[PDB]
Design a protein around this nucleic acid. Structure first.
Ligand SMILES: Cc1cc2nc3c(=O)[nH]c(=O)nc-3n(C[C@H](O)[C@H](O)[C@H](O)COP(=O)(O)OP(=O)(O)OC[C@H]3O[C@@H](n4cnc5c(N)ncnc54)[C@H](O)[C@@H]3O)c2cc1C
Length: 456
DNA sequence: CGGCTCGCGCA
DNA sequence: TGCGCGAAGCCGAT
């Protein structure tokens, strides 16, 4: 609609209709932040043109029961901060409970909303909620990509087989879509308790908590401070202290040399566009700069591409034909070990390097990026079938990772087990032509003994 | 046809 | 640790 610094390719219409006379409602789901949020900015530009206020509506679902307290507290504390941030901009935030397909349509009718705006997510349940809302509303319904630097429907029109095909496409659109962010103007016009939704939710998740032997929780909640502000300092400390050595030590789990931005990036507490803008300006190691930019741009946004064009992104059917044929041929092969879900969960395998990886996931909620590949590939090696390996890897990833339930997860798991965005390797038993990792290969890359001792 | 985000042998 | 090769199937630039 209008705005000089607003690219119209970031916004697409889910439903046409007659503009209402009420405020513009932003259905915040994925990008939980006030700054550097295209969905909140575009909602504001429309409200300014229509001479109406803009309000933010957030629907708390029953989805937190599937996960644990570690993600629930991380999200809820971030929203408590966001409530204060929007209040200073004179933007009232409403927090609802229940099915978004029923609650959002009721709010748009109760509040007499004029236009509805939401952010983009390629997940299945988001597309289901939007279709339920479309049938219930009569006002226009727009969608804005505030997560990806290049809007997902613009970067490619089909499923990308590999990164070397997606890389030229994305880097060619960077001069257009890589731009600064204008400030969020405060509202000229005017018009549940999160402290209750937090206490009610923790009392429900308390039985499912991950514990020790003498009933002491394994999760250490002091490693990552949640919120928009703390995410800014994590990115600042990375670019100043850790980015120079990122290209050389990103695969060393004994060195805390990663950006640690994924939990904030998953919940939308910081914009990846903002991080790219600051890394692009920083004068650091040219090899390290390109290595990081390939992670936050190519591999992050191609994961949205994978989920957005493959609805069965968490299933065996999404695997490439060569991988499905190979894994099918080795279904009857004898496995060296067979472990259940509970044995993987408690870290009681024969491999101490795998066990230490699970210990890092249970204690900190963020396992080092290199060991995540070794972690998932050994699940496939020591399971009944490729389907049970996929089920277990997704279950443990979504239950204990702060960045779980994310397109980066289902794409990263499909890469590990189904060879998605990968290629074929030497033929083996059980795994077939899926890329193989070994305990001995990690020994010649990093001090395995230190990583094992660090996590029992 | 050339090139893709492991293990392996050898400085 | 850093390099160069090997084993593998397929995209896509023509
Ligand atoms: C088995 C497995 C499961 C995964 N599950 C998840 C998950 O649930 N949630 C999640 O956010 N990521 C997941 N990924 C990707 C990866 O684990 C994380 O992006 C990263 O390890 C988080 O640490 P970091 O942000 O400090 O890494 P950094 O090296 O600092 O990466 C910077 C950013 O680049 C992106 N990125 C990096 N590596 C990848 C990758 N392989 N694929 C896609 N994007 C990437 C992320 O946005 C990340 O925040 C998984 C990877 C594997 C191998």
């Amino acid at each position: 609609p209008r705005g000089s610094h607003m690219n119209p390719k970031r916004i697409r219409a889910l439903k046409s209709g007659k503009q209402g006379d009420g405020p513009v409602v932003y259905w915040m789901s994925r990008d939980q932040r006030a700054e550097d949020n295209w969905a909140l900015l575009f909602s504001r530009a429309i409200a300014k043109e229509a001479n109406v206020p803009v309000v933010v509506v957030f629907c708390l679902t029953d989805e937190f029961l599937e996960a644990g307290i570690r993600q629930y507290e991380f999200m809820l504390k971030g929203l408590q901060e966001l409530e204060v941030s929007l209040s200073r901009k004179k933007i009232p935030s409403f927090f609802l409970r229940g099915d978004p397909g029923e609650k959002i349509s009721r709010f748009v009718k109760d509040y007499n909303a004029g236009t509805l705006v939401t952010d983009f997510s390629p997940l299945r349940i988001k597309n289901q909620w939007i279709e339920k809302v479309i049938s219930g509303i009569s006002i226009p319904f727009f969608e804005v990509d505030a997560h990806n630097v290049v809007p997902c429907w613009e970067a490619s029109q089909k499923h990308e087989y590999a990164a070397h095909t997606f890389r030229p496409k994305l880097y060619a659109l960077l001069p257009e879509f890589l731009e600064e962010f204008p400030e969020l103007e405060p509202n000229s016009v005017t018009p549940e308790t999160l402290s209750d939704v937090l206490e009610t939710g923790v009392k429900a998740l308390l039985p499912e908590r991950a514990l020790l032997k003498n009933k002491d929780p394994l999760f250490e909640p002091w490693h990552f401070e949640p919120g928009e502000k703390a995410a800014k300092k994590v990115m600042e400390s990375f670019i100043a202290d850790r980015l120079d050595s990122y290209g050389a030590l990103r695969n060393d789990p004994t060195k805390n040399m990663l950006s640690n931005l994924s939990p904030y990036l998953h919940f939308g507490q910081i914009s990846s566009q903002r991080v790219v803008l600051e890394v692009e300006k920083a004068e650091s190691n040219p090899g390290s700069k390109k290595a990081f930019l390939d992670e936050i741009l190519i591999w992050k946004e191609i994961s949205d591409n994978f989920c957005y064009y493959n609805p069965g992104y968490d299933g065996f059917e999404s695997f490439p034909s060569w991988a499905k044929e190979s894994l099918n041929a080795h279904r009857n092969d004898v496995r060296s070990h067979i472990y259940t879900l509970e044995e993987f969960e408690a870290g009681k395998t024969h491999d101490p390097l795998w066990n230490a990886s699970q210990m890092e996931l249970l204690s900190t909620g963020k396992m080092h990026g290199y060991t995540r590949m070794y972690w998932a590939k050994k699940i496939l090696e020591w399971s009944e079938s490729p389907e049970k390996a996929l089920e277990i890897a997704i279950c443990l990833n979504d239950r204990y990772e702060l960045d779980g339930r994310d397109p980066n997860g289902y794409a990263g798991i499909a890469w590990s087990i189904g060879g998605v965005h990968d290629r074929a390797w030497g033929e083996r038993e059980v795994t077939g032509k899926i890329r193989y990792m070994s305990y001995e290969g990690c020994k010649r890359k990093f001090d395995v003994k230190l990583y094992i001792e660090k996590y029992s």
